[PDB]
Each structure stands twice: as C-alpha cells, then as structure tokens.
Amino acid sequence: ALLRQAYSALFRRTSTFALTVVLGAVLFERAFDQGADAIFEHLNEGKLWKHIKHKYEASEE
Amino acid sequence: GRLMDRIRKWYYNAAGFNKYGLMRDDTLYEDDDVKEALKRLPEDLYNERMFRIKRALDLSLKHRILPKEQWVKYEEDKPYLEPYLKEVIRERLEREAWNKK
Amino acid sequence: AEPEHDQRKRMGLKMLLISALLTSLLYYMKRHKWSVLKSRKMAYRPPK
Amino acid sequence: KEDAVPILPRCRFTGSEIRARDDALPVAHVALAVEGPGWADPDNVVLHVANAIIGRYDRTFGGGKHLSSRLAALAVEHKLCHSFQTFNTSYSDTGLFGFHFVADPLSIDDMM
Ligand SMILES: CCCCCCCCO[C@@H]1O[C@H](CO)[C@@H](O)[C@H](O)[C@H]1O
C-alpha cells in the first residue's frame, strides 16, 4: 500500500513532508520542462530554428 | 376585494426566505430599533429565532434549502417581533418629539 | 513586432498545464477542509 | 453454547465532534480523546505513565504555580480553567485516551 507507505515515510513528520516537497519539486521541474518543450516542438515541426539550423550551420559558402 | 392579499401572498413566495425556514421578522436588518426589540423578546421566542437563523446560515453555506414540506407557509408566518418593534419606535418618537418641545 | 512570440506561447503551454494541475489540487483541498461544515448537522433541543 | 463467552462485534471509532451549547450554563466542559488500545495491550502501561506526566488539577491544589505538571502550572499562571483531568479508559477491544477540562467561557481557547 503506497498510500500508507507514503504517509508513514513522507507525510507524517513535518520535516520529511518538506523534504518531499523540495525533492519533489526538483524532480517535477526536470520532468515537466522536458515534456512541455517536447510537446511544444512536436506541435511545431520544422518551424523552429532548431529545425532549419542545419541548412546554414556549416553547410554554406 | 382580495387583491392586496393576492399580492402579498405572491410577494411572500417570490421573496423566498420561507425556503430557509425563516419568518419574515427573522429577515429584518438589525438597526437600532430592531436591536432594542430583540432584547425584549421572551427567552423562548429569542432562542427559536436564533436556531432558525443559525439553521438558515448553515443552509446558505451549503447552497441548499429546506425540503418543500418544511417551508413556512404565508398564513403560518408568526410576526413575533412586529409588536415589540412598533412599541420601541413609539417610545423613540415620543422622546424625540418631547426633546424638541 | 514581437520577438518573444515563440517563447510567449511555449510559456502559455506551461501556464495551462500547471494551472490545470494546481487548480484541481487546490479545489480538492478547499473541499476537504470545508467538508466539516458541508456535512455538519445540527438540532434544536429546548428543555421544552 | 451455554459455557462459551460471546465475542462482541467491534466498535468503530470516529474522529468527530458534538457541540451542545448553552450559554446559560456558568462554565463549559470540554473532552478530547483519541482511540485507545484496549485492556490486553501493554502500551496501556506507557499511556498511564504519560497521563501521569500531564496529570490533573483543580483550584484547590495548594501546590499552585509550583506544581510539576506544566499544564497545571500554566492553568494557574493564566487562570486557564477550574480543573482538568487526563484519562485512559480501557475496554476489551478499544478505549478512549484523552482529557477533560472545565473552564470559564473566555478561557476555553487558551486552555485547549
Ligand atoms: C499558475 C502558475 C503558473 C506558473 C507557470 C510557470 C511556467 C513558466 O516557465 C517558463 O517557461 C519558459 C519557456 O520554456 C522559460 O523560458 C522560462 O525560463 C520558464 O520560467
């Protein structure tokens, strides 16, 4: 039972609760950003400089 | 004929405080006269008013009303305060008039 | 006219997701706390 | 059937409150408690020890402000209540561990 494990290990002691928020945030940020950016770029295939960059990036003159 | 009575009973239902189980007098804005009148109410009438009001505040926070069966009916609404209030105002006007003379 | 155009929208996307997540979460919490009053029952018991 | 001792259906505990209000009463009574383990459990020995630390009080305890019980001291220093008691009421499969105090309408909050 994760809910109970979570409760006992993370949410019971106010100290561990804060620790869970901080460490929780650090991991949420890394994940959430990667996903958002990923979604944004997919919805904009070949429109961003990231996408057309190669055409002039060391392949001209 | 019974026109004034048709209107009143109509307004009474349109107002809708009876859906909270409140008496017309329960809904009065408590200015000075009303505050004095309330202090004169017998204990039982005062506690009944208090429960009714508390009950209405609880319905209000819940966003519910009483079941249709429990609604106060126009003709069963007891004007428990109007008598006291009229006296309180009569006294006030006496003093006001007298302090001018 | 608006170089920020792309960054602005990328931000908009993030604002929506977080907004959806955070709003739901807070809705539950408000409800949780208020449950005490929402389900509360009372009675008038005079010595009658 | 006759010489078998019947096992009672367990009683479910509920975190909740009941407020019976009568401003006409001179002083208020308040009792708060969590679920206890029940006769058989050894922890009851510790709970009782625990209750001894907090203990009890009443306006006639001569010890007054020098009582070892912190709650008793505060009660005296701040006129927090007329009295208070801790308890560990046991039952077969459950119990109540809490406290009860009697205080004047305007000191209930600080006492609690
Ligand atoms: C309701 C609370 C909404 C807060 C939303 C925070 C999201 C903002 O996130 C922003 O996204 C940009 C685009 O990737 C980045 O360039 C910024 O550095 C970053 O802070």
Identify the structural domains of chain A with CATH numbers, from first to last. Answer: 1-61 (1.20.5.260)
Alpha carbon distance D53, D95 (integer Å): 20
Number of Cα atoms under 13 Å in the Cβ half of residue A48: 15
**Would you give the distance in Å from CA D66 to the centre of its chain?**
22
If you search the block for the tokens 């070892």, which residue do you land on? D68
For domain C4-48, the CATH superfamily is: Cytochrome c1, transmembrane anchor, C-terminal (1.20.5.100)
Would you tell me how many other CB atoms lie within 10 Å of the CB of residue B50? 13
Q: Do B47 and C46 touch (CB under 8 A)?
A: yes
Q: Do C37 and B55 touch (CB under 8 A)?
A: no
Number of Cα atoms under 13 Å in the Cβ half of residue C8: 4
Alpha carbon distance B56, C44 (integer Å): 13
User: How would you label C6-28 residue by residue, b for 16+ Cβ within 10 Å and e otherwise?
Assistant: eeeebeeebeeeeeeeeeeeeee
- According to CATH, the topology of domain B1-101 is Cytochrome Bc1 Complex; Chain F (1.10.1090)
Q: Do C42 and B61 touch (CB under 8 A)?
A: no
Residue nearest to atom 8 of ligand 1 (CA): C11
Say yes or no: C38 contacts chain B, CB-CB below 8 A.
yes
Residue B73 is given by DSSP the state P
Residue nearest to atom 6 of ligand 1 (CA): C15
Does ligand 1 have an atom closer than 6 angstroms to the CB of C21? no
Experimental technique, in short, is X-ray
The phi, psi pair for B36, rounded to 5°, reads -65, -50
Q: Where are the domains of chain B?
A: 1-101
Would you tell me how many other CB atoms lie within 10 Å of the CB of residue D47? 19
Q: Where are the domains of chain C?
A: 4-48
The phi, psi pair for B73, rounded to 5°, reads -90, 140
Q: Which of C11, C22, C23 to mutate to test the pocket of ligand 1 (most atoms within 8 A of CB)?
A: C11
Say yes or no: A9 contacts chain C, CB-CB below 8 A.
no
Alpha carbon distance B54, B61 (integer Å): 11
- DSSP codes of every residue in chain D: -TTS-PPPPPPPP---------TTSSSEEEEEEEE---TT-THHHHHHHHHHHH-EEETT-TTGGG-S-HHHHHHHHTT--SEEEEEEEE-SS-EEEEEEEEE-TTTHHHH-
C17: nearest CB among A36, A37, A48: A36
B61: nearest CB among C37, C44, C46: C37
Run of H or E residues at A4: helix A2-6
Would you tell me how many other CB atoms lie within 10 Å of the CB of residue A30? 10
Please check whether residue D100 is in contact with residue D85, taking contact to mean a CB–CB distance below 8 angstroms: yes
Resolution in A: 2.8
Please check whether residue D94 is in contact with residue D16, taking contact to mean a CB–CB distance below 8 angstroms: no
Cα dihedral D100, D102, D107, D108 sign: positive
**Are B and C close enough to touch, i.e. 3+ CB pairs under 8 angstroms?**
yes
Residue B47's alpha-carbon distances to B16, B39, D3, in angstroms, are 22, 12, 55
If you search the block for the tokens 């190669």, which residue do you land on? A54
